[PDB]
Amino acid sequence: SDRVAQLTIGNSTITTQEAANIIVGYGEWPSYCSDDDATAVDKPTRPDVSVNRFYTLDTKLWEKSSKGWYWKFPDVLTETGVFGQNAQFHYLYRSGFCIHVQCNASKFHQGALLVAILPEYVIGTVAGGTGTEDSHPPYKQTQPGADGFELQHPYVLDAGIPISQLTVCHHQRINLRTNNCATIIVPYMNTLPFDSALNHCNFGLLVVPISPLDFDQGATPVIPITITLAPMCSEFAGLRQAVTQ
Amino acid sequence: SDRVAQLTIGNSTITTQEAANIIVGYGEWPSYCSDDDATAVDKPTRPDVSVNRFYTLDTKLWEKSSKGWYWKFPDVLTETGVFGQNAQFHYLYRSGFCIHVQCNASKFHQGALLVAILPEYVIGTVAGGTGTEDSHPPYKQTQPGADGFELQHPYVLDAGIPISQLTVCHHQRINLRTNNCATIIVPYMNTLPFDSALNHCNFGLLVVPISPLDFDQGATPVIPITITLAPMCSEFAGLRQAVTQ
Amino acid sequence: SDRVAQLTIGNSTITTQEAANIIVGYGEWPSYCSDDDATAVDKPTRPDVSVNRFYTLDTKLWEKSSKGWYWKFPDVLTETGVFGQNAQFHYLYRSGFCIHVQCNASKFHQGALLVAILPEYVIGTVAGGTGTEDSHPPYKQTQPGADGFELQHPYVLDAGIPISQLTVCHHQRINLRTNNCATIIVPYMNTLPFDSALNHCNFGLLVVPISPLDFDQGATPVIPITITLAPMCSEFAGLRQAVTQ
Amino acid sequence: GDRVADVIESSIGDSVSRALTQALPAPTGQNTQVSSHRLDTGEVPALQAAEIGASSNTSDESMIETRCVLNSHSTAETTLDSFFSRAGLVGEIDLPLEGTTNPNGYANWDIDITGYAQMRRKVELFTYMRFDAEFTFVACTPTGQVVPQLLQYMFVPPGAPKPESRESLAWQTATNPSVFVKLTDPPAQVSVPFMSPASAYQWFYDGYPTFGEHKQEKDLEYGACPNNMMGTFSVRTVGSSKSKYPLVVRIYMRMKHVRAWIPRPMRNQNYLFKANPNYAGNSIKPTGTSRSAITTL
Amino acid sequence: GDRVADVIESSIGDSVSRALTQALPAPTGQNTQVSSHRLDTGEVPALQAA
């Protein structure tokens, strides 16, 4: 009644038998842009099923020596399917998301992952270590795509802010003795009603082990983490040639 | 509410804590012979509790190298209890059945059995292998009794018909990670309202491993399969001396 | 709905996820002394939350070679907290109890404990073995306190009465494959409405393994048994200096 | 008109935001109610599933025997007005005579309130904040001495010409707003509106403003939002000649009519730069104090 | 008189004994009733938790 879930959107369907629940972000479900909030006058295209569907990015391995990974939205879908063509062919973009993270393990495995949504996850750097260099992150760290990027210092989230207060955003846990899926539903969060998908990323998705993975020699040592995500209430406006960046 | 079942008929009672459900065959529960369908005029004897009760035949071992077993009904009860005396003392016979198959294993065991009811399971033979000999099965293969018989070629069910289409009859599965009992309720199926129990067998009961049993060295290697079955709505007519065959 | 329980009394709270149920002793919940049953005329003090609360005594280890343990009530709380000061400062005492026994083990552990309440558990002795000596138990065997005492001959309960008929009193079982807590609620049982807590013990609490503990080499071999108990509807009367015995 | 059934039975164009929660009034702290003992099964309020990502709904009425407490403690001082409507240093401008800082008698200050840690860590608790403000300029000598000098505080919005000198033509303030004050007067205090082309300022911007390739040259642009570049503050000594007093202008901003969205983790590391969440990676300090062991104090 | 709410809403002094059971008359042994066969799921009266 609460540990089982089927998520159907589009031509896609996820099953889970070992769920917790669904987190609906900031108590707002995704919606479409009202005529009061809108400023642009062009008619937006609303492709219902060709972009609002579950996309599967890649698979990270939870090892003992893991530190964490982050993915930036909507950068993860700007080279993938029909979404990443409407987003390149258009200038404006608006959508929510349903993120769904998968990690399966046995009943003889232990560990926990914090799966959180951090809006406007701006990436800082070590500043040379001494704090004198005003270094900056390259493009393959702020918009790393579907491959994601490995956190160097996950205590401060590579932004000088503590991981411990990160439950103030959306989150779930994947505790392997309780659940193997983490489902968060995110609305469109920005000061503007639409924005560019290639220049601006609305939020980040952190997957950090707070408790480390452990097992005894003989069990399956490959414990994959798979990110699977669906746009929701997508909208595109301002059509011109396809530019990638 | 659905994994637990108690089957009470007669002086007999089965418990199961790890069931699937009960299969009621061809959507017909067993019944008694109506006066329109009847042709014989003698009054039949209807012994309620002395023959309609659970009988336990024997125990087959599920090994790694198993192929399958079949049992023929009502031949399994023609030498057993009060049923197998009323059936020998009479000429005519009518009954349904509740079959119940038992296989227990741990949570560290894996395997599947197809437990199916095949009406008029006529037994063919290899025909010499070349197909030139018009060989025939002996009596200890077509009516093998409570001991059952081991399938030689379970792909064709020793009748030239594929195992894969056998789910078109009654069936359950015993998947050891889900269930340990398989309960099928069969009505009387024949072109006639009554028939001989010693000459004619109405259906067969196949127990075939589709997925093979596997376990690691240290677990209980003896995984028994036990057949347990109850007549239902039994009826006998035409009384004379007791003949066995 | 029945395997989960939270017991809240006072400033104390117990959780259990693997319970059986609660045993309410002799179908009587604890109560206060009525004016018809009362004979003493002094006003009794009824301290609600400072004595009616869960107290944790000690921890016995269930080994292979165990025989059993007993604890005597209210002797277990005559040196503990505010109860054991009101009981020393007063002469009269009346209370029920909620006993709660804890033993945790894995799913690869097996064993059973009988957890029973025996009123007026008078302690006999071996009488020299031959039965000629009219020996007597010392004070550190009839009132052993929170440490409890190890049964010498648990077949006869060190009183000449069989363990096998002990289910006629209150009891639960701790079967490690079913439950890890045993909750019994006992009313005040005596021929008198009040009595001394230091001289008279109303009942005993037996914890005996009927089935012995077993595990394979590698599992946690320390399986503790913890006694945790709460007075209920306590009442004290007749105030004078604090005497301990 | 719509004819096919998938279009009639469609949720496309549902602009109404479906909210799960509703804001109720909480002028006081919640009162405590009387509780007694509980000795049943099934109802177990102490046990939670924190994997859900929610917080515990357990109260003290269910964990202990409680009394009635009629609370009259007000939640009025935790509002965002009461927390942010408190003037703090956001800027400091030095106008010396000799040196390098501003040796000509004018000074331009690009408006950013992220140069002082005590007001910055208060705003970076949120990612979006919309407010009107009240700026206050406390002018004085290095020693704190009040002197007889006239100044001109010109607001230079974006696009308008910045003054290249004290004798400049931008100082005529025909359309830009300005304030003339003597240092002998009370500090100038003006109210400012919400002046963003967006619906709220944003202290964190996960993105670039410009299209194109993003090489190591134009990596400064990471994080820069032009919706927060509200322009320039300019100050001069009103005069054709050189002043005789050194000067300092200190700027204090007070927010009013505040709205905020999307709380964040609070900064635990020392800031280093303006509009840059960089940190010293070698000298990473833990968020709080430490111990010798976990069983002691 | 009682004023505070923890004292008004108190079960202190409840002298009445709360009994779960009730004694009913059994002058004879219980009669046996007619039973038939049962072939369903969920209802399993032979299985207990001792």
Ligand SMILES: CCCCCCCCCCCCC/C=C/[C@H](O)[C@H](N)CO
């Ligand atoms: C004599 C007139 C002077 C009036 C000057 C008032 C300037 C108005 C600006 C107020 C708004 C400040 C908002 C600043 C935002 C942050 O600094 C940016 N995100 C930069 O990081």
